Design a binder for this molecule. Structure first.
Ligand SMILES: CN1c2c(nc(N)[nH]c2=O)NC[C@@H]1CNc1ccc(C(=O)N[C@@H](CCC(=O)O)C(=O)O)cc1
Ligand SMILES: OC[C@@H](O)[C@@H](O)CO
Length: 715
């Protein structure tokens, strides 16, 4: 007998019923009861998929917005500003609106969770959702194992007084109180017949201190009386021996995303006093795997239990209806449902019951000169050439993203002649240029009205990459993304933005920047082959992006912006593995940005702090970098002030693009005065924090005007 496990199966539904029910309820189109009914149909759908493939059925997985927030509610972590917890009304207020909790990436994934705010050191059992869901399935005659976020990971993903609760001394006191609630929750489940509880402790894979593990031992020693199964994933466990010494009868490990877990098990072994649950089916990549080999690993691991490596919700629901994919691709794919089925086949087998798309020229082309990663001349030399060619005034102004998209624009996109559309875009671009000239901007953008996503736009134009029809993946709340699929050698068969950029530039005398997405970002928002090293794929895409950079140059574009939000976002969970990663990330960006001395390269990143990556940022060969400085009132400039030898230009974002309230010239002035207390005035550009697509035209116009005015006052 081989016990099969599974978790994280998508909750959105094959037709995104989850999304429709959420928005319908928010819009007031359906009652809260109807919402519940819709949610229950999804519960049954999830449970039926599990039942048909594995032995252990999870429960408490269908969060109405975010499971981390659910955990916060369970333990009473409800900020005072929300008042008395009234249920869904309060729930959604914590999740969205003007008083909502902070949203951030869940580890190194595509999913975003809501950050709990710990205002009091006393947790109490506010609502036992695990017991509720447990009983709901019991009523339908189905036994289930509650899925909960562990006490350690919960605190690790939360903050107090605006700071992370990650230091042992910070967590110690809180944990004692926190564990108590978990104790009450587990006690209530066992009394009602719960046989197994699935505890998720992914934070065990972060670079922890020995001191953290001493805390983790106390926490679990107190929970030893309960039938708990601990899961860890996304990377290897920081301290193997300490983890396997934990008083828990069964432990799950991720043997897919890393090689360290296996090596440690081979060196130290696994306690005959516990059972191993082998996470051997990838939950973040869509490829079919040779089950004979997975079976070998299980046997080697000595484990008698299997499951997916990490949550399955990072994959689409099912491959079933993807019949318009390139030739030969579907047969090599496997989504959430197919993964579940892969675990069943693996179960049966174990119990005894039972060169694709490769471009040789391109691959070799990328494989074979250092100079490809280094621009001909150093910054100081390029700066002079560029400044003489652009002739820009002190404190130049610009924007670094897409402009708002009116309903007519959005509608025009969906609605039908390839010429009527291309004509509609140019009319939009034309108006965009005129508006920028009227307000007084110095460097312009074409608006990007023809783009819906900064990665899908290019993926559709890249060879070796495919797009799906129903491959939706939950991003956060009710927002879903459709990740592209890099299945073969990547190459660019024809210019991707020339038409739009060129046309925009012919309408004005001022410089219009090219707008591109970096290679690491294109790779990280999409699924990709595991047969070849990440570096290679990144380089191939970078090559492709560079060919575009050159066409823009030949066409006469004097400035090109390259957005690489993944620079830090795709960085490993373990900072200890950052050196290796940043080595190729930096190379990838530079290969794509390897432009002529006279071409001004702009790098854009919406990070709230550069203290931890400034050393890596410094190796990127851009000429100017835009940052978000409004929130910190420019204090975010410190990382740059303290970097001895910093000399490149900085685009200082002086307006929070996430707030509709127009900023006052006086407020923006405070930000600029702050940044120029140390750095030379010639390095400073003035611009908004980030993209403008989520804003309205009547909020932008005035804001941009106030920005231009302050620019002049500054002179
Ligand atoms: C991969 N994601 C991503 C990112 N930005 C960063 N920095 N990192 C990321 O991983 N931006 C896009 C996406 C997350 N954000 C979002 C934002 C909105 C919608 C959204 O509104 N989706 C619509 C469909 C939109 C369309 O394509 O027409 C939906 O129906 O959910 C999705 C994802
Ligand atoms: O180490 C991982 C941490 O920085 C967060 O990304 C967890 O969500």
């Amino acid at each position: 007998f081989t016990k099969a496990y599974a978790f994280g199966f998508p909750k959105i539904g094959e037709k995104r019923e989850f999304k429709k029910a959420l928005e319908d309820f928010w819009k007031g189109k359906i009652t809260e009861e109807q919402f519940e009914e819709e949610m229950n149909k999804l519960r049954m759908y999830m449970v039926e998929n599990y039942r048909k493939n594995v032995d252990v059925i999870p429960s408490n997985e269908l969060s109405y917005y975010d499971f981390v927030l659910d955990t916060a509610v369970m333990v009473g972590a409800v900020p005072e500003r929300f008042g008395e917890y009234r249920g869904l009304s309060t729930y959604f207020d914590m999740a969205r609106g003007g008083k909502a909790l902070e949203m951030t990436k869940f580890f190194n994934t595509n999913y975003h969770y809501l950050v709990p705010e710990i205002e009091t050191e006393e947790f109490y059992l506010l609502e036992n959702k695990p017991l509720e869901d447990y009983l709901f399935f019991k009523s339908k005659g189905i036994e289930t194992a509650p899925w909960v976020i562990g006490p350690f990971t919960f605190l690790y993903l939360s903050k107090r007084n605006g700071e992370w609760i990650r230091r042992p001394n910070q967590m110690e006191k809180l944990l004692e109180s926190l564990v108590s609630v978990y104790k009450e929750v587990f006690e209530k489940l066992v009394e009602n017949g719960c046989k197994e509880i699935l505890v998720n402790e992914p934070a065990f894979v972060c670079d922890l201190e020995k001191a953290h593990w001493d805390l983790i031992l106390n926490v679990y020693r107190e929970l030893s009386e309960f039938p708990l199964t601990v899961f860890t994933y996304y990377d290897s466990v920081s301290d193997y021996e300490a983890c396997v010494s934990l008083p828990v009868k069964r432990l799950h490990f991720d043997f897919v995303s890393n090689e360290e877990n296996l090596k440690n098990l081979e060196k130290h072994g696994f306690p005959e006093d516990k059972k191993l649950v082998a996470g051997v089916i990838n939950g973040r990549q869509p490829w079919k795997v040779d089950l004979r080999k997975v079976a070998s690993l299980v046997e080697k691991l000595g484990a008698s239990a299997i499951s997916n490596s990490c949550p399955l919700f990072h994959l689409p629901v099912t491959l079933e209806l993807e019949n318009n994919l390139p030739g030969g691709l579907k047969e090599k794919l496997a989504f959430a449902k197919e993964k579940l089925e892969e675990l069943k086949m693996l179960k049966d087998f174990l119990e005894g019951k039972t060169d694709f798309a490769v471009d040789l020229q391109a691959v070799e082309r990328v494989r074979n000169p250092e100079d490809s990663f280094r621009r001909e001349k150093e910054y100081t030399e390029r700066d002079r050439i560029q400044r003489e060619r652009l002739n820009l005034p002190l404190f130049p102004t610009t924007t670094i993203g897409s402009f708002p998209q009116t309903p007519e624009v959005r509608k025009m996109r969906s609605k039908i002649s390839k010429e009527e559309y291309e004509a509609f875009i140019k009319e939009q671009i034309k108006k965009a240029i005129e508006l920028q000239e009227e307000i007084g901007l110095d460097v312009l953008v074409h608006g990007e009205f023809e783009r819906t996503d900064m990665v899908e736009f290019f993926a559709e134009k890249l060879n070796g990459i495919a797009t799906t029809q129903n491959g939706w993946v939950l991003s956060y709340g009710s927002r879903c993304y459709r990740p592209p699929i890099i299945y073969g050698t990547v190459t660019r068969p024809e210019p991707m933005t020339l038409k739009e950029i060129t046309y925009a530039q012919s309408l004005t005398e001022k410089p219009v920047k090219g707008m591109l997405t970096g290679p690491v970002t294109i790779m990280s928002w999409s699924y990709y082959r595991e047969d070849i090293p990440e570096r290679e794929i990144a380089y191939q895409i970078a090559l492709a992006i560079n060919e575009e950079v050159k066409d823009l140059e030949e066409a006469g574009i004097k400035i090109v912006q390259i957005d690489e939000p993944a620079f830090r976002e795709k960085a490993p969970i373990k900072k200890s593995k950052w050196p290796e990663y940043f080595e190729w990330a930096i190379n990838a960006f530079n290969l794509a940005a390897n432009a002529r001395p006279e071409t001004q390269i702009h790098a854009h990143m919406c990070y709230s702090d550069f203290n931890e990556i400034i050393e890596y940022i410094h190796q990127l060969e851009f000429d100017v970098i835009s940052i978000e400085a409004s929130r910190s009132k420019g204090e975010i400039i410190s990382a740059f002030e303290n970097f001895k030898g910093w000399i490149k230009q900085i685009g200082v974002g002086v307006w929070d693009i996430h707030s509709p309230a127009v900023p006052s010239i006086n407020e923006m002035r405070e930000i600029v005065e702050r940044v120029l207390r140390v750095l030379p005035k010639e390095l400073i550009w003035i611009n908004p924090d980030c993209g403008l697509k989520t804003r309205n035209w009547d909020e932008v116009i005035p804001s941009l005007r106030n920005m231009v005015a302050l620019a002049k006052e500054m002179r």
